[PDB]
Enzyme design. Structure first.
Site, short mmCIF file in Angstrom:
data_model
loop_
_atom_site.label_atom_id
_atom_site.label_comp_id
_atom_site.label_asym_id
_atom_site.label_seq_id
_atom_site.Cartn_x
_atom_site.Cartn_y
_atom_site.Cartn_z
N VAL A 187 52.38 35.66 -0.26
CA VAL A 187 52.40 34.84 0.95
C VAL A 187 53.67 33.96 1.09
O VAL A 187 54.26 33.91 2.17
CB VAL A 187 51.10 33.98 1.08
N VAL A 273 57.61 34.02 -7.26
CA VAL A 273 56.64 34.99 -7.79
C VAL A 273 55.29 34.36 -8.12
O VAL A 273 54.54 34.90 -8.92
CB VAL A 273 57.16 35.69 -9.06
N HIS A 447 35.93 36.26 28.14
CA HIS A 447 36.81 37.34 28.62
C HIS A 447 37.67 36.78 29.76
O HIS A 447 37.11 36.21 30.69
CB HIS A 447 35.98 38.52 29.15
C1 LIG Z 1 42.22 34.29 40.36
C2 LIG Z 1 40.96 34.47 39.55
C3 LIG Z 1 40.95 34.16 38.19
C4 LIG Z 1 39.80 34.33 37.43
N1 LIG Z 1 39.84 34.01 36.11
C5 LIG Z 1 38.75 34.15 35.32
C6 LIG Z 1 38.76 33.82 33.87
O1 LIG Z 1 39.81 33.39 33.34
N2 LIG Z 1 37.64 33.99 33.16
C7 LIG Z 1 36.50 34.45 33.72
O2 LIG Z 1 35.48 34.60 33.01
N3 LIG Z 1 36.42 34.78 35.04
C8 LIG Z 1 37.47 34.66 35.88
N4 LIG Z 1 37.38 35.01 37.25
C9 LIG Z 1 36.10 35.49 37.77
C10 LIG Z 1 35.84 36.93 37.38
O3 LIG Z 1 36.87 37.77 37.91
C11 LIG Z 1 34.48 37.36 37.90
O4 LIG Z 1 33.46 36.48 37.39
C12 LIG Z 1 34.14 38.78 37.48
O5 LIG Z 1 35.14 39.69 37.95
C13 LIG Z 1 32.77 39.16 38.03
O6 LIG Z 1 32.54 40.52 37.69
P1 LIG Z 1 31.45 41.37 38.49
O7 LIG Z 1 31.36 42.72 37.84
O8 LIG Z 1 30.21 40.52 38.65
O9 LIG Z 1 32.02 41.47 40.00
P2 LIG Z 1 33.50 41.87 40.49
O10 LIG Z 1 34.49 41.76 39.36
O11 LIG Z 1 33.76 41.11 41.77
O12 LIG Z 1 33.35 43.44 40.80
C14 LIG Z 1 32.61 43.92 41.93
C15 LIG Z 1 33.29 45.18 42.47
O13 LIG Z 1 32.35 45.96 43.21
C16 LIG Z 1 32.92 46.31 44.49
N5 LIG Z 1 31.84 46.44 45.51
C17 LIG Z 1 31.25 45.46 46.23
N6 LIG Z 1 30.30 45.99 47.05
C18 LIG Z 1 30.29 47.32 46.85
C19 LIG Z 1 29.53 48.48 47.38
N7 LIG Z 1 28.58 48.30 48.32
N8 LIG Z 1 29.83 49.71 46.90
C20 LIG Z 1 30.78 49.91 45.97
N9 LIG Z 1 31.50 48.89 45.44
C21 LIG Z 1 31.30 47.61 45.84
C22 LIG Z 1 33.98 45.27 44.78
O14 LIG Z 1 35.01 45.83 45.60
C23 LIG Z 1 34.46 44.87 43.40
O15 LIG Z 1 35.58 45.65 42.99
C24 LIG Z 1 38.54 34.85 38.06
C25 LIG Z 1 38.56 35.16 39.43
C26 LIG Z 1 39.72 34.99 40.18
C27 LIG Z 1 39.70 35.33 41.66
#
Ligand SMILES: Cc1cc2nc3c(=O)[nH]c(=O)nc-3n(C[C@H](O)[C@H](O)[C@H](O)COP(=O)(O)OP(=O)(O)OC[C@H]3O[C@@H](n4cnc5c(N)ncnc54)[C@H](O)[C@@H]3O)c2cc1C
Ligand SMILES: Cc1cc2nc3c(=O)[nH]c(=O)nc-3n(C[C@H](O)[C@H](O)[C@H](O)COP(=O)(O)OP(=O)(O)OC[C@H]3O[C@@H](n4cnc5c(N)ncnc54)[C@H](O)[C@@H]3O)c2cc1C
Ligand SMILES: [Cl-]
Ligand SMILES: [Cl-]
Ligand SMILES: [Cl-]
Ligand SMILES: [Cl-]
Ligand SMILES: [Cl-]
Ligand SMILES: [Cl-]
Ligand SMILES: [Mg+2]
Ligand SMILES: [Mg+2]
Lengths: 469, 469
Positions: A187, A273, A447
């Site tokens: 180390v 060492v 995440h």
């Molecule tokens: C700028 C930003 C930063 C963020 N940072 C963080 C972070 O650091 N940590 C954290 O934990 N969370 C964070 N979030 C929140 C996080 O992204 C969400 O909590 C997470 O993505 C939710 O996942 P989900 O699977 O529930 O829905 P989503 O990720 O919203 O996925 C849903 C998907 O299904 C699709 N969909 C909707 N309706 C239909 C339908 N009828 N048919 C087919 N497809 C459809 C949508 O288009 C979308 O792509 C952040 C959000 C934003 C905007």
């Protein structure tokens, strides 16, 4: 009048002194170190070890990162320079602040810091020879020996504090050596070699043994060696130093490798060492303390010596020569003295290498688990596809778990990667709680985070990581 | 033919699909998103959320560190510049790599990704309207609704995705705005504001509520507000936007705070006052699914809807709107479908804010613990005196624990500082194991590490931290 006398003011000694003061003891801490004309507590760790090495690793990392890892972000800097004297002075200032802080802690806890040397005499009396003044013979009921360590010496590569240095001198080079030899690939050598390599030195790290990091999990050491070599750290294996020849401002290292006598010339040579227990002037001939053939003070699982009321801790006794091991042993000794069955779990002591990326591990390696009769299952997941790691540009390394196939018991965790030194604490905590692999699989990890690789590795033990191919 | 149909390909949906495929189900994931011209999985998180925001936070942090935090290390550079197009391109390439990665995971697991929209019809029938092809009605045994979220819209500040943007446009500005207004001081606004401020924007953040981060522990939000404000984020508390006015390439925000009507002009305005469940085109009028008040699909603790065989997860339902919450609810729904009494612990869900320094917490705040009837004791310790933090130049923030004074049970952990997102997982694990404060006190944390502040804070709960002055 003191109930307890601690001989040594390093991590082990001062932690013990503070804990004893908290428990109501009248405590004295004897510490002889004088660092740049100032008596200083903190031991090896603070004064010439952990802290200074971590400071140089951080500054050198910032330099390498600035020169080589900004372009992908679209960031340009033009010329990039470092002023070694300022970099080293920052480290010296940090050390000064921290050692002054410990001094304040002892004063605040009502502990007397006896500045000088201590020797254990018969009947647990302690001879205190101060730097200035009259020698005192203290008569405590309890004594904690915490005299620590010093570097192992290599007769054929004698340290002269100039061309051939030990780890102390290696933290203080006035100029970056153009060619640097490092004897020892543990180390300390890996960290010191990385510091100077990052600042421009051509470095060769010699390891006399046939194996790299023998106490680490084989999967970890194999990948880790590959990673360090890739960075430009030239680790030379099977090379046993047989002599040195200092000619002016150069040193030629003679070594045997693959049955042949070889040589290489360097501007500076670091001898690191390993370290050995230091107990010079610690014990009177009739102290009654039992010694071991290897130079240690013999103690049991609770750090108790053969003399009732005398405990020995840290780098002076058996076990990993780590700062936190010394600290927790100090606390354990004091609590034992006070009647509590405190106990350090030697199977949950964390090991960390502060290179970039960091390596860290805790518990049993895959080989150790097998050796101990376990039916072993393992699982690992890499940072390569980790969203957080990609965003940070640190997608290398992995988390590996070692577990029992019959009981599902977590036995060990081995990590290379971003935040490794803090991620390994997750495994240490799980081990302390006697976690099963399933316990970790059932938890929610944030995440995007480096830590979710831990969750994926837990799932991988039973072949069901979500993001695996 | 399919056993399970998942509507939505975000963290909740694709995680559910993969788990289901591991359990032997034939699975269909319906995801409509078209990002940058082509179909893509990953949802909000991967396409316009967590990942892109983390990429920009890292690059902007590198820029800021290179301009302001190199001098102390003795490192100097020429004039520092950033190529915004290339910085954004890096983020875009990471998102593309990751989206492609998910696609290959579904294929590897034998899951069919149906590119288009899904709608739950009566009798668990699902209508798949592809982007290109014949419409088909599927008859699965189980359905998981994972349609996610979209930003909250406010008619007062309409998003044109040019001058007035939502979080999506905020991640793609073609130039750094000189003056940036941000409506919403939540996790998202603090992060987006920090990115552009680091890159040179003069930033103002409006928060409608009288409190900053009301869900956070009061001690954390207080210190965190002070830290962010000192960095240059002008966070205006109790500032309610009454109207916006666009004049050429400028936008004037009219608002009320402390009884007075005020205004200020900006080059760009981001609207990020929160996110709401998205369920447009998700349910037929006769699907048989129950609703609550605002706009969530009603579900019990295991995410089961009012219709047998149908579950709803993620941002679509109650609880923290986080990726890891969606991910765990997806695995829970699938294990419930498969017959196991899986459960998500909503009191151990981690919240992280990826500013620098990071803030993270899990469990109960001090106020929540008191509300639930606990006699509360707390303890905290700062990084300012931590040797690892000093070595790294990261000496700020603290770890605070909340615990029950009668039983010693750990109740929550609240952190601001280095590696906060990874240190908070240590508290999460301790809570999952029903840890007492004493359990953590008896563990050996590595030295020197950011994590040992956790140990000191545990000891501070009982007023016996070794390094507390
Ligand atoms: C700028 C930003 C930063 C963020 N940072 C963080 C972070 O650091 N940590 C954290 O934990 N969370 C964070 N979030 C929140 C996080 O992204 C969400 O909590 C997470 O993505 C939710 O996942 P989900 O699977 O529930 O829905 P989503 O990720 O919203 O996925 C849903 C998907 O299904 C699709 N969909 C909707 N309706 C239909 C339908 N009828 N048919 C087919 N497809 C459809 C949508 O288009 C979308 O792509 C952040 C959000 C934003 C905007
Ligand atoms: C370069 C380097 C890097 C390191 N990095 C790390 C790391 O990252 N992590 C880690 O855990 N460990 C590290 N270590 C090891 C760590 O410094 C030791 O494990 C730790 O200091 C041991 O603590 P101790 O209290 O047992 O002994 P010491 O720290 O050696 O303290 C013993 C003290 O007692 C004094 N003393 C001895 N005899 C007497 C006497 N008779 N009277 C009065 N005083 C006396 C000595 O002056 C000394 O100051 C490193 C060591 C080196 C050399
Ligand atoms: Cl050494
Ligand atoms: Cl030396
Ligand atoms: Cl092994
Ligand atoms: Cl909040
Ligand atoms: Cl609170
Ligand atoms: Cl509703
Ligand atoms: Mg041989
Ligand atoms: Mg159990």
């Amino acid at each position: 009048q003191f109930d307890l006398v601690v001989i040594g003011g390093g991590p082990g000694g001062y932690e013990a002194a503070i804990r004893a003061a908290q428990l109501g003891f009248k405590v004295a801490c004897i510490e002889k170190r004088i660092h740049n004309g100032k008596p200083s507590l903190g031991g090896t760790c603070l004064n010439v070890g952990c802290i200074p090495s971590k400071a140089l690793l951080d500054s050198s990392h910032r330099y390498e990162d600035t020169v080589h890892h900004l372009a992908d972000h679209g960031i340009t800097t033009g010329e990039v320079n470092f002023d070694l004297a300022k970099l080293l002075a920052r480290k010296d200032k940090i050390v000064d602040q921290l050692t002054g802080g410990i001094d304040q802690l002892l004063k605040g806890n009502g502990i007397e810091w006896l500045k000088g040397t201590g020797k254990l005499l018969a009947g647990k009396k302690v001879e205190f020879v101060p730097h200035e003044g009259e020698t005192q013979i203290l008569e405590p009921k309890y004594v904690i020996l915490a005299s620590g360590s010093v570097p192992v010496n290599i007769p054929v590569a004698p340290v002269d504090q100039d061309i051939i240095v030990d780890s102390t001198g290696a933290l203080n080079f006035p100029e970056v050596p153009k060619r640097l030899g490092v004897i020892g690939a543990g180390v300390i050598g890996l960290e010191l070699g990385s510091v100077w390599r990052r600042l421009g030195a051509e470095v060769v790290v010699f390891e006399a043994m046939d194996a790299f990091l023998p106490m680490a999990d084989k999967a970890l050491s194999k990948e880790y060696q590959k990673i360090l070599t890739k960075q430009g750290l030239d680790i030379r294996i099977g090379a046993k130093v047989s002599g040195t020849e200092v000619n002016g401002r150069e040193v030629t290292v003679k070594y045997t490798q693959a049955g042949e006598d070889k040589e290489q010339t360097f501007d500076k040579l670091i001898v690191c060492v390993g370290r050995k227990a230091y107990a010079e002037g610690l014990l009177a001939e009739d102290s009654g303390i039992k010694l071991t053939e290897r130079g240690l003070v013999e103690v049991n699982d609770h750090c108790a010596t053969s003399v009732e009321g005398v405990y020995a801790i840290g780098d002076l006794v058996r076990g990993p020569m780590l700062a936190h091991k010394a600290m927790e042993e100090g606390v354990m000794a004091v609590e034992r003295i006070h009647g509590h069955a405190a106990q350090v779990n030697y199977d949950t002591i964390i090991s960390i290498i502060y290179t970039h990326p960091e390596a860290a591990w805790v518990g049993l390696t895959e080989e150790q688990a097998k050796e101990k009769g376990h039916e072993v299952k393992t699982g690992q997941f890499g940072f390569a596809v980790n969203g957080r790691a990609l965003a940070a540009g640190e997608g290398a390394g992995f988390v590996k778990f070692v577990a029992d196939a019959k009981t599902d018991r977590l036995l060990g965790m081995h990590v290379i990667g971003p935040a490794a030194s803090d991620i390994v604490h997750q495994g240490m905590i799980a081990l302390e709680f006697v976690s099963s692999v399933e316990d970790l699989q059932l938890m929610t990890f944030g995440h995007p985070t480096f830590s979710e690789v831990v969750h994926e590795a837990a799932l991988a033990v039973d072949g069901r990581a979500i993001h695996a191919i």
